[PDB]
Paper text:
Ribonuclease A was one of the first enzymes to be studied by X-ray crystallography. The commonly accepted residues associated with the active site of Bovine RNase A are Lys 7, Gln 11, His 12, Lys 41, Asn 44 and His 119. Waters W86 and W91 make interactions with imidazole groups of His-105 and His-119, respectively. The crystal structure of orthorhombic Bovine Pancreatic Ribonuclease A has been determined to 0.85 Å resolution using low temperature, 100 K, synchrotron X-ray data collected at 16000 keV (λ = 0.77 Å). This is the first ultra-high-resolution structure of a native form of Ribonuclease A to be reported.
The space group is: P212121 (19) and the unit cell is: a = 43.9980 Å, b = 45.6970 Å, c = 51.8900 Å, α = 90°, β = 90o, γ = 90°. Refinement carried out with anisotropic displacement parameters, stereochemical restraints, inclusion of H atoms in calculated positions, five SO42- moieties, eleven ethanol molecules and 293 water molecules, converged with final R values of R1(Free) = 0.129 (4279 reflections) and R1 = 0.112 (85,346 reflections). Five SO42- moieties and eleven ethanol molecules were located and refined in the 0.85Å Orthorhombic RNase A structure designated SO41151 to1155 and EOH A201 to A211, respectively. In the orthorhombic structure Lys-7, Gln-11, His-12, Asn-44 and His-119 occupy single sites while Lys-41 is disordered into sites A and B and the SO42- group into sites A (60%) and B (40%). In Orthorhombic RNase His-12 H-bonds to the SO42- group both directly and via a water molecule. There is good clear electron density for this residue which has been modelled largely as a single conformation but with a minor branch at the end.
Residue numbers in the entry: 1 to 124
Write the structure that this text describes.
């Protein structure tokens, strides 16, 4: 089975594009990255940075996760990210998403040995 670290990568990393400029980026990526089985996953963010630069966030600014737990880390810099949010007319199995692009700080939850991202907690 897919580890938590691997799931974070599949769901949240997109190092090979620098940004989403296409209105169809999320429609394609949510399907490609296996986020549309059974139900459309409603909301998901992709990060357009190298895996090593995202992994490096686990030793950046320690902050609380949005549930108040202490294993979250905010990137010092903004990073290029894309939010994918299921539209108000989307109907599974034809999952439809609004793509929005921005530079924002990311907040990841890290766990394990090695201590790596396992959840995309928030953006700032």
């Amino acid at each position: 089975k897919e580890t938590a670290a691997a799931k974070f990568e599949r769901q949240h990393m997109d190092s090979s594009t620098s940004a989403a400029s296409s209105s169809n980026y999320c429609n394609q990526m949510m399907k490609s990255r296996n986020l549309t089985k059974d139900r459309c996953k409603p909301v998901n963010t992709f990060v357009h940075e190298s895996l090593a630069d995202v992994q490096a966030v686990c030793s950046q600014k320690n902050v609380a996760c949005k549930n108040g737990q202490t294993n979250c880390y905010q990137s010092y810099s903004t990073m290029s990210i894309t939010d994918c949010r299921e539209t108000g007319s989307s109907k599974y199995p034809n999952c439809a998403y609004k793509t929005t692009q921005a530079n924002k700080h990311i907040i990841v939850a890290c766990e394990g040995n090695p201590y790596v991202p396992v959840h995309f907690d928030a953006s700032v």
